[PDB]
Amino acid sequence: NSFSGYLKLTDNVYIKNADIVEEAKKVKPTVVVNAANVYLKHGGGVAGALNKATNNAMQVESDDYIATNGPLKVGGSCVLSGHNLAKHCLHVVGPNVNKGEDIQLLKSAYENFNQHEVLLAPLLSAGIFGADPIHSLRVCVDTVRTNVYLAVFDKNLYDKLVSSFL
Numbered sequence: 001n002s003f004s005g006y007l008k009l010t011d012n013v014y015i016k017n018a019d020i021v022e023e024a025k026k027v028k029p030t031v032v033v034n035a036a037n038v039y040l041k042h043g044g045g046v047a048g049a050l051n052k053a054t055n056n057a058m059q060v061e062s063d064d065y066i067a068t069n070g071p072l073k074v075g076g077s078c079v080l081s082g083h084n085l086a087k088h089c090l091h092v093v094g095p096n097v098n099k100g101e102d103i104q105l106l107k108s109a110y111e112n113f114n115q116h117e118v119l120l121a122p123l124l125s126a127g128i129f130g131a132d133p134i135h136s137l138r139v140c141v142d143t144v145r146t147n148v149y150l151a152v153f154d155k156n157l158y159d160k161l162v163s164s165f166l
């Protein structure tokens, strides 16, 4: 949890323009959040990047979790190993609004972060799930009460977020 170069937006939300994979390898936080789908198939986006950085160990472990427990619900989560990235990986499913899933479930997705005092995380439902990333940051700020360090890869998006929030 030795985070560096973050900008404090609220009492508990910090943001950096950084690749979440590089942040996790540098900091080795207690918890790294994955933006997952209900079957934990880490095919692209943040999920594909985190799985690739574990050389598919996250995917093998995720397939075993699904075989024994069944899929997650949208808005739900599970805690699995963080492998070489963190002590734990909190896989969280935000709604895929491009497929009609309710945007109200973005609040339930971010409520899962409150179970952990400190987390390294990406924005949920941004990217291929189609939610507006500034709206996703607003829900994070209104919902998360524990300390969250958000890593945002895209510099153009990072600048837009910092201007809208402060």
Ligand SMILES: O=C(O)[C@@H]1CCC[C@H]1c1ccc2ncccc2c1
Residues within 6 Å of the ligand: 019, 020, 021, 045, 046, 049, 122, 123, 124, 126, 127, 133, 151, 152, 153, 154, 157
């Ligand atoms: O922070 C971003 O720019 C977006 C917003 C939500 C998903 C983030 C993202 C997407 C792909 C990625 N691919 C490799 C590493 C990190 C990655 C992060």
